[PDB]
Curated annotation (Swiss-Prot):
Matches recorded under InterPro entries: UDG_fam1 (IPR002043), Ura-DNA_Glyclase_AS (IPR018085), Uracil-DNA_glycosylase-like (IPR005122), Uracil-DNA_glycosylase-like_sf (IPR036895)
Record's subcellular location: Cytoplasm
Keywords for this protein: Cytoplasm, DNA damage, DNA repair, Hydrolase
Top-level lineage group: Bacteria
Gene: ung
Protein name: Uracil-DNA glycosylase
Family matches, as PROSITE patterns: U_DNA_GLYCOSYLASE
Species assigned in the record: Escherichia coli (strain K12)
Entry EC number(s): 3.2.2.27
Any one GO MF annotation of this record: uracil DNA N-glycosylase activity
Enzyme class at the top of the EC tree: hydrolase
The organism's taxonomic lineage, starting at the top: Bacteria, Pseudomonadati, Pseudomonadota, Gammaproteobacteria, Enterobacterales
Subunit record text: Monomer.
Length: 225
């Protein structure tokens, strides 16, 4: 089963298609929407349903130019690393042996290892956090989490912040592995994100069940001649 297999019906529902209509309208009404339409579903492009190993929930896409490109917490090459991602990198440096501060914030290489970087809201108006929160995206990502819970086995969920925690509140804690911490945002990171030991902990779960660990040092696409 692929994502389209299990979401094809869901994507024919009016809530979902009305959501896309609204986005498509706002893009043509003098408002910039992030990320670009071709990137909205990049988390699904880069880690297929059967490849999901670790799910990390974000909430809103980043709302500045060059930041959002369809992966929770990630930014494009050449963009400054946002404070939430810098705090994640700090926890990584304090816990993953050999890890050092990346010089970029691009996390595609996580996604390609089975890390589903899923924002619960998949678009946003430029400069206006949460501006599409009351469209249909939360409904859609509810269904996505529900399908991973049902169709997959042994997934680690990293739930950061009250919003993400609620969002995954009914995941099967037997068949899957749920880890909670406050959010890596500067407003909450010292309240429990630091010391959470989620990157190591996820890897040990994976290893325990015979799966390979995530290489958490993210890498940029290379150059060709």
């Amino acid at each position: 089963l692929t994502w389209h297999d299990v979401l094809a019906e869901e994507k024919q529902q009016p809530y979902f298609l009305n959501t896309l209509q609204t986005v498509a309208s706002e893009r043509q009404s003098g408002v910039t929407i992030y990320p670009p339409q071709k990137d909205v579903f990049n988390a699904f492009r880069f880690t297929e349903l059967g490849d999901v190993k670790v799910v990390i929930l974000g909430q809103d896409p980043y709302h500045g130019p060059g930041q959002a490109h369809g992966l929770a917490f990630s930014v494009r090459p050449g963009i400054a690393i946002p404070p939430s991602l810098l705090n994640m990198y700090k926890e990584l440096e304090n816990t993953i042996p050999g890890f050092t501060r990346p010089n970029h914030g691009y996390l595609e290489s996580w996604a390609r290892q089975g890390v589903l970087l899923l924002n619960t809201v998949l678009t946003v108006r430029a400069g206006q956090a949460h501006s599409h929160a009351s469209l249909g995206w939360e409904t859609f990502t509810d269904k996505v989490i529900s399908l991973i819970n049902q169709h997959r086995e042994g997934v680690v969920f990293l739930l950061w912040g009250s919003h993400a925690q609620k969002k995954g509140a009914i995941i099967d804690k037997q068949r899957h592995h749920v880890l909670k911490a406050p959010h890596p945002s500067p407003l909450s990171a010292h309240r429990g994100f630091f010391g959470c030991n989620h990157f190591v902990l996820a890897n040990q779960w994976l290893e325990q069940h015979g799966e390979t660990p995530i290489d958490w040092m993210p890498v940029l696409p290379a150059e060709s001649e």
